[PDB]
Design a protein around this ligand. Structure first.
Ligand SMILES: [Mg+2]
Ligand SMILES: [Mg+2]
Ligand SMILES: [Mg+2]
Ligand SMILES: [Mg+2]
Ligand SMILES: [Mg+2]
Ligand SMILES: [Mg+2]
Ligand SMILES: [Mg+2]
Ligand SMILES: [Mg+2]
Ligand SMILES: [Mg+2]
Ligand SMILES: [Mg+2]
Ligand SMILES: [Mg+2]
Ligand SMILES: [Mg+2]
Ligand SMILES: [Mg+2]
Ligand SMILES: [Mg+2]
Ligand SMILES: [Mg+2]
Ligand SMILES: [Mg+2]
Ligand SMILES: [Mg+2]
Ligand SMILES: [Mg+2]
Ligand SMILES: [Mg+2]
Ligand SMILES: [Mg+2]
Ligand SMILES: [Mg+2]
Ligand SMILES: [Mg+2]
Ligand SMILES: [Mg+2]
Ligand SMILES: [Mg+2]
Ligand SMILES: [Mg+2]
Ligand SMILES: [Mg+2]
Ligand SMILES: [Mg+2]
Ligand SMILES: [Mg+2]
Ligand SMILES: [Mg+2]
Ligand SMILES: [Mg+2]
Ligand SMILES: [Mg+2]
Lengths: 151, 117, 70
RNA sequence: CGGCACGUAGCGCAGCCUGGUAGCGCACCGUCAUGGGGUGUCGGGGGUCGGAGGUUCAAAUCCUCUCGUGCCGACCA
RNA sequence: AAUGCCCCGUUA
RNA sequence: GCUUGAGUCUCGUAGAGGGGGGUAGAAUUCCAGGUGUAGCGGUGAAAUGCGUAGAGAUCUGGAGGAAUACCGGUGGCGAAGGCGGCCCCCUGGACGAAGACUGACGCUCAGGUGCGAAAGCGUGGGGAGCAAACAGGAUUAGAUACCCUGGUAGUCCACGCCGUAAACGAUGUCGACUUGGAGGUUGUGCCCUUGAGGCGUGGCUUCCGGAGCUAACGCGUUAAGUCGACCGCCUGGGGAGUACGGCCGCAAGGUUAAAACUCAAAUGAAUUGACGGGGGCCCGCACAAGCGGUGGAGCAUGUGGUUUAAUUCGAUGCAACGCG
């Protein structure tokens, strides 16, 4: 906003593991306030991904988020007589949130049967560098590289 | 082909594009690159990054001649005045002289009329 | 504006020197001036405008600093 | 006086070699845009081939005639 | 360093 | 008759003052050649255009035209217009110093005469760049324009014509008087120029401002203040600086210059608001960053339209339409 910057609100970590990252992920995944359903879904999919790919839920989740993590986004500047799609770096919270959002969106788009299965499949694909999430990440990276002529 | 260690880098920076020409001390050209052939057209052509990319490409092209010492002669205004020289230094040519050869007339031919945009 | 890099002279320092020499020479200003023709009347009028601007920036700011603000 | 080439959406033009559709532009209709119009955005209705005859399974589409059209020529005394 | 634009009936 | 106005003489000072002839550097364009290859140019973005017939870039030589960066400065000169590289020839004016000289010879000026930006006209040359007209490509509803690519008269030279400009300081010429301040430029006297200095004394010029004046804005010793001499000009706006006539001009057109008709206002300065695709600061779910929707389907409800005997009346930008 114009006037001032604000203070950040606290988010309670999850009970299963205590990860604020997982808490934010479930808060992004939930809808209409059904946090219980969101927690059930995320926990089921995470346990599935863990027993699939070996290492525990935290390791799988963080490697997937790292493979989906962006570094440079693009913004509009509109300085003077010309408009510019300037690329700008991203901060940690922003890139984590964007990764989570792209992951949940890819899961929603996936035409599997259950949401837990969709999410687990998307997470595995991201860990192995596949899926619409990493696709969009590469697309935005390419766009930033193209518009790299602005600083 | 022959090899030479001392050369000149004629930079022609315009408000729209940027040309880079590596040549021998006798003006005999060896290789050239432009921001319009480096993949940037229109609004990206008149940028310093495109000029530096063009300088890198010209260095890669003239690499065959094995050039070490290089004197730069810059002409005309535009972004491609310092970024291209920086890209040359990065490519690793021993800069020797940095001259300005911008043609400044002494009240000669009159310029065109003003643009009423 | 010809410069020669001295011994152990960093390329960045040579670039700074070149920029400063070109600024002192005023090549870009002359180029921007000669890019488009200026009517003699327009040139004289711009000169007089700059002269009165200088007179203001020399007299009014002094007469204002002579007083206070709070 | 003969002859050549036309007739297609509201309009100006396609479609004629192909016998086995009816297009395009503008315009017209409904919504969005606008303070309200125009400009502009979208989504839509559209004629069914100048008219008769026969050819053919089937004709705007082939011909035979007829309408109205613009044009080309009436010579030599 | 200068991509969109044009218009509002009459009296009071 | 006099020297105080006016002018002449001696010595110097500065100056883009004027005319004529040469000469130098940068830069643009073009021609030839060498290196070299896939773009160059241009725009907000593109295209026309230039390019593989080798462009652009770079280097060498040559041809030619125009103007003279830095000096450069609300600096200088000139009656005005206007004047800008350097050198030379001719030439006008201004100023400063001491004296000498003529002794009212002075000021203004209707007519008249001359000069008079740029554009334009005639003849003969010249022609790089720019560029009316013109062609094409874009923008646009259209674009006979702004923008882009090319480009002819013209811009240049010699001789003549035209005689107009916001030809403005929008302020006629000449002379006298009237508090000041800060400069710039150009002479000159004195003090040790002890230094670029300290004390004055003349010309031109820039800004502010006092009394006074002014409708106000503003002028303000260079007056738009107090006076005098002469001339030019004005008598509401439009019609109209137009018509006819006269003079001038090759022409374009120039100068002098009305009437009928029509309106009851037109106008200048400033003030308070509003607005600005003017500027500066600031805020708002205004934008941005995100979530969820509407517009697509069925249904409820209101509205418009239509129909009906009636389909009661009202609200009907945002601020009416699940509203009374
Ligand atoms: Mg141009
Ligand atoms: Mg109208
Ligand atoms: Mg005297
Ligand atoms: Mg030359
Ligand atoms: Mg050549
Ligand atoms: Mg040459
Ligand atoms: Mg100057
Ligand atoms: Mg003078
Ligand atoms: Mg006597
Ligand atoms: Mg002339
Ligand atoms: Mg002529
Ligand atoms: Mg001629
Ligand atoms: Mg042009
Ligand atoms: Mg045209
Ligand atoms: Mg041209
Ligand atoms: Mg006049
Ligand atoms: Mg006058
Ligand atoms: Mg007189
Ligand atoms: Mg006087
Ligand atoms: Mg007076
Ligand atoms: Mg007065
Ligand atoms: Mg008169
Ligand atoms: Mg009258
Ligand atoms: Mg007349
Ligand atoms: Mg007459
Ligand atoms: Mg007024
Ligand atoms: Mg406003
Ligand atoms: Mg404002
Ligand atoms: Mg938003
Ligand atoms: Mg009702
Ligand atoms: Mg309500």
């Amino acid at each position: 906003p114009r006037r001032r910057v604000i203070g950040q609100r606290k988010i309670l970590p999850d009970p299963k593991f205590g990860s604020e990252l997982l808490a934010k992920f479930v808060n992004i995944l939930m809808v209409d306030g059904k946090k219980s359903t969101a927690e059930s879904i995320v926990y089921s999919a995470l346990e599935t991904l863990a027993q699939r790919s070996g290492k525990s839920e935290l390791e799988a989740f963080e490697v997937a988020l790292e493979n989906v993590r962006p570094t440079v986004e693009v913004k509009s500047r509109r300085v003077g007589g010309s408009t510019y799609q300037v690329p700008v770096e991203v901060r940690p919270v922003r890139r984590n949130a964007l990764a989570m959002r792209w992951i949940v969106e890819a899961a929603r788009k996936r035409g599997d049967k259950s949401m837990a299965l969709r999410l687990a499949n998307e997470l595995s694909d991201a860990a192995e560098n596949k899926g619409t999430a990493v696709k969009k990440r590469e697309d935005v990276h390419r766009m930033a590289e193209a518009n790299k002529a602005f600083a | 082909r022959k090899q030479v260690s001392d050369g000149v880098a004629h930079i022609h920076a315009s408000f729209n594009n940027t040309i880079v020409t590596i040549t021998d001390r006798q003006g005999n050209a060896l290789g050239w690159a432009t921001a319009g052939g480096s993949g940037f057209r229109g609004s990206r052509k008149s940028t310093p990054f495109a000029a530096q990319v063009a300088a890198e490409r010209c260095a890669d092209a003239v690499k065959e001649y094995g050039i070490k010492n290089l004197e730069v002669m810059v002409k005309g205004p535009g972004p491609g005045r310092e970024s291209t020289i920086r890209a040359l230094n990065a490519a690793g040519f021993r800069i020797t002289n940095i001259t300005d050869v911008t043609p400044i007339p002494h009240n000669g031919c009159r310029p065109p009329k003003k643009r009423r945009v | 504006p010809v410069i020669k890099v001295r011994e152990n002279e960093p390329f960045d320092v040579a670039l700074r020197r070149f920029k400063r020499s070109c600024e002192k020479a005023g090549v870009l200003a002359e180029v921007r001036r000669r890019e488009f023709y200026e009517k003699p009347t327009t040139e004289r009028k711009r000169a007089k405008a700059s002269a009165v601007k200088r007179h203001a920036k020399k007299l009014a700011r002094e007469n204002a600093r002579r007083t206070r603000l709070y």
